[PDB]
Design a protein around this ligand. Structure first.
Ligand SMILES: *[C@@H]1O[C@H](CO)[C@@H](O[C@@H]2O[C@H](CO)[C@@H](O[C@@H]3O[C@H](CO)[C@@H](O)[C@H](O)[C@@H]3O)[C@H](O)[C@H]2NC(C)=O)[C@H](O)[C@H]1NC(C)=O
Ligand SMILES: *[C@@H]1O[C@H](CO)[C@@H](O)[C@H](O)[C@H]1NC(C)=O
Lengths: 48, 49, 48
């Protein structure tokens, strides 16, 4: 599907599911990184 | 448990078996809450003094 | 993915010299060999 932003949605990315609010970010990923996590081991951000 | 992440159990694992994995994880986590609150009550008592 | 070349291969190797191939770049339907019995043994782990 397309992206639905700035509201609570159900999401399903390429191997990552859950619910929450999707927003754009300025996180600088490396060329070999798919997603990142918070200090606590939970998903912080995802590459589309 | 297979994973600390609930979603990584529930999502991919067969729903029957999954209850076993989830139940185990729940018990694990509940224990930390009981510990936490117990200590807080003790700390609170010291503050009262 | 050419699973036909995996399960309908003409020749299989011996166990002492088991062989491996890499499967990639496709959309795979895994119900084909699951919801229609073609096996005497069917055991999967981690994921249903
Ligand atoms: C490997 O090749 C064999 C056949 O050479 C495949 O098995 C066969 O798959 C068909 C398709 O479902 C099975 O059903 C058949 O459907 C036709 C449709 O008109 C029907 O006329 C037949 O009577 C039959 O119902 C067929 O039973 C099945 N045969 C066997 C022995 O399983 C096999 O699936 C191929 N494996 C892979 C991984 O491609
Ligand atoms: C079994 O898999 C085949 C694959 O094409 C599908 O068409 C069929 O509906 C499946 N059966 C059930 C009960 O889901």
């Amino acid at each position: 599907t397309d992206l639905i932003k700035n509201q609570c949605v159900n999401f399903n990315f390429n191997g990552l599911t859950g619910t929450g609010v999707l927003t754009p970010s300025s996180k600088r990923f490396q060329p070999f990184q798919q997603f990142g996590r918070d200090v606590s081991d939970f998903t912080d951000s995802v590459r589309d | 448990a297979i994973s600390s992440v609930l979603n990584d159990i529930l999502s991919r694992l067969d729903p029957p078996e999954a209850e076993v994995q989830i139940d185990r994880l729940i018990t694990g986590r509940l224990q930390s809450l009981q510990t936490y609150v117990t200590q807080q009550l003790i700390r609170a008592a010291e503050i009262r003094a | 993915c050419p699973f036909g070349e995996v399960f309908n291969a003409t020749k299989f190797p011996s166990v002492y010299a088991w062989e491996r191939k890499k499967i990639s770049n496709c959309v795979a339907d895994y119900s084909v060999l699951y919801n229609s019995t073609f096996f005497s043994t069917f055991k999967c782990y981690g994921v249903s």
